Design a protein around this ligand. Structure first.
Ligand code: NA
Ligand code: NA
Length: 327
DNA sequence: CATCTG
DNA sequence: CAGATG
């Protein structure tokens, strides 16, 4: 956690690069396990040879560790931090809708900058056009003071559309947290379930509303259960318009809400432990259910959840307010 | 994992 | 349809 941090980060930068630039998925994987395993390792790695002892770690890495340990740097790390090409890729990728692949094409196409991009909007898809348009906003964090004002509007509108809707805002928003990265809304209705053969309107109906009033301003994507888009806090008394923010809506068959809601809530850490305990309590949990565990190794059957309460009960645990769902 | 592209 | 992005 700090005894072998430099080494671990390195491997990360390294991993990163194999993946992002080179298409070295394998190598890229290679770095990751390594960092993962040095991660656990309890002592002060005092050498490569030492490290090699580790599973996951070979000669090439071990070699790298040496140079690192030996001198506060690594030539490869050095070169990769300079190379304006590889910098391009990390950069472009900062745009929504641009990943590595795209990033690489564009570069070899000669686009490595923001302006580069605008000059050739023509070359981007709807998402990326969008992404370029909001780069700034996209990067800005979401403050709860705003977060609240937004959830206010959402809930009120889903409500009008139909009193039977059930919306919930997950994320760290839900955990407590002062700011957040994007609005994530969970969505359901009684009239939609595991078996219930669909209902698309269920989703497009609300979406409609939001936009109706100008809260939803642009579309990243819109399926029949998921919608990725752009909302915006109606600017008040003209002088201070707000940042544009990523928001997502997702339909769920009622019978599987709470686990969803549980799960999207977090923390990643929380889930695990909670999940680990579920298992101890002879249970299994995932994004959708809670099944009694058979001793044969495994076994099925989704247990019924009417709330987040139902789940805890099951695993016979302390009901956790979202705040303390941290770790 | 769902949606988009082409 | 494969392949990419989130
Ligand atoms: Na991107
Ligand atoms: Na293939």
């Amino acid at each position: 956690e700090t005894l072998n941090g430099g080494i671990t980060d390195m491997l990360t930068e390294l991993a990163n690069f194999e993946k992002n630039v080179s298409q070295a998925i394998h190598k890229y994987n290679a770095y990751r396990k390594a960092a993962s395993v040095i991660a656990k390792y309890p002592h002060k790695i005092k050498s490569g040879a030492e490290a090699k002892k580790l599973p996951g770690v070979g000669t090439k890495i071990a070699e790298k560790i040496d140079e690192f340990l030996a001198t506060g740097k690594l030539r490869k790390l050095e070169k990769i931090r300079q190379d304006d090409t590889s910098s391009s890729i990390n950069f472009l990728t900062r745009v929504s809708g641009i990943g590595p692949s795209a990033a690489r094409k564009f570069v070899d196409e000669g686009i490595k900058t923001l302006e580069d991009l605008r000059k050739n909007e023509d070359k981007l898809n709807h998402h990326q056009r969008i992404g370029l348009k909001y780069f700034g906003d996209f990067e800005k964090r979401i403050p709860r003071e705003e977060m609240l004002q937004m959830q206010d509007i959402v809930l009120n509108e889903v409500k009008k559309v139909d009193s039977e809707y059930i919306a919930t805002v997950c994320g760290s928003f839900r955990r407590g947290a002062e700011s957040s990265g994007d609005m994530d809304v969970l969505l359901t209705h009684p009239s939609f379930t595991s078996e219930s053969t669909k209902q698309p309107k269920l989703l497009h109906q609300v979406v409609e509303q939001l936009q109706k009033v100008h809260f939803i301003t642009d579309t990243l994507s819109k399926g029949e259960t998921k919608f990725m888009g752009v909302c915006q806090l109606p600017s008040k008394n003209d002088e201070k318009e707000y940042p544009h923010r990523r928001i997502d809506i997702r339909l769920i068959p009622k019978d599987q809400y709470y686990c969803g809601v549980l799960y999207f809530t977090g923390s990643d850490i929380f889930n695990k432990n909670m999940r680990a305990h579920a298992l101890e309590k002879g249970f299994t949990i995932n994004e959708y259910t809670i099944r009694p565990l058979g001793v044969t190794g495994v076994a099925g059957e989704p247990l019924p959840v009417d709330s987040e309460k139902d789940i805890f009960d099951y695993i016979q645990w302390k009901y956790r307010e979202p705040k303390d769902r941290s770790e």
